[PDB]
Amino acid sequence: GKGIKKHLKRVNAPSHWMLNKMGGQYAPKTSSGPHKLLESIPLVILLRNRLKYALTFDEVKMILIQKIVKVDNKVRTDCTFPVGLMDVIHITKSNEYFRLLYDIKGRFVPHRITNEESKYKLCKVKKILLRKGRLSIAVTHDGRSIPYIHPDVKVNDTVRLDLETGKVLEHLKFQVGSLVMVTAGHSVGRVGVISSIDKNMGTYDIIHVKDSRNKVFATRLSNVFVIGDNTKPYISLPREKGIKLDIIEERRNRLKA
């Protein structure tokens, strides 16, 4: 037959997974989740090759059996949960919160997060639809549908959704003074203010982003993430702080130890 495929070869493991060539034959194909397979990783990989909590897949299963891992302040049990672009994952046995961030080098990395700021996740809505009786709903990259949004919120804005009540708090728009992340660009991991946009008739629209070192780059409109306005990046960025570090002077920094 020609049904939906159910395996991924180890060589065909996605780019940012960073899995060894000889360590077996197959990598897990994430079950249908809230985020795309090409841009999210399973919790098994996340806690194995980064957290290093266990040494075998079955040990990871035994960990997952206890209702200790939590996503968006609620319980999850299936070993194939892609964490997604932005979220919060909580572990109560150690009372530690992790939040998924990127690197200027193009990967996924967990970031230690305190309890107060661990209750806030930022979601970029992807679609705006109208339902029966004039109620407007927003569909997010998070695979989450938020009904009854403000008339203020537009398509590309980002929304301060609370984890527990499942309700909006505030909106953040996309002026030339709004901090935006790049999701899957070849220059992924750069934090900038965006100098301006460039809308093209019936095609992709290219937006220019400016950095803290006056570097200017361009990116497709599809894969941007409103993270905060000119005041500050609202959430805690990783150690690299989202500024991309040039190769030669990066080698200089590495050499100078």
Binding site: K52, Y53, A54, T56, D58, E59, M62, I63, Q66, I68, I91, K93, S94
Partner: protein, 120 residues
Amino acid sequence: DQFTIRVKKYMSNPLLRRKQFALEILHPNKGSVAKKEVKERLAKMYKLNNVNTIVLFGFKTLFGGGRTKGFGLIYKNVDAVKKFEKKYRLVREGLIDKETKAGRRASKELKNRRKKVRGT
């Protein structure tokens, strides 16, 4: 015989209620030493009163002797030992014995027992 103990990447895992690290034992001019000796030494190191709560594995002595790289695991109690582990490493440690050793004969007999061809 004397030796030196070195522990790398000592990290405690509350989720398994265990700990992990790499064992580097220096025994110059003396061949590979038994695991019981270093078990006693590490018990005294970490103030451990029982011996059956330690798992050791992957002890490669490397070319030339005088060094040994290995990975060590400690347990909270025998309950955790029997709880968060499979049976083969426990067999190697010396707490339980192995199961039936037919192998693939179990599956061969399962296929042989064609359903509703055997009244029992």
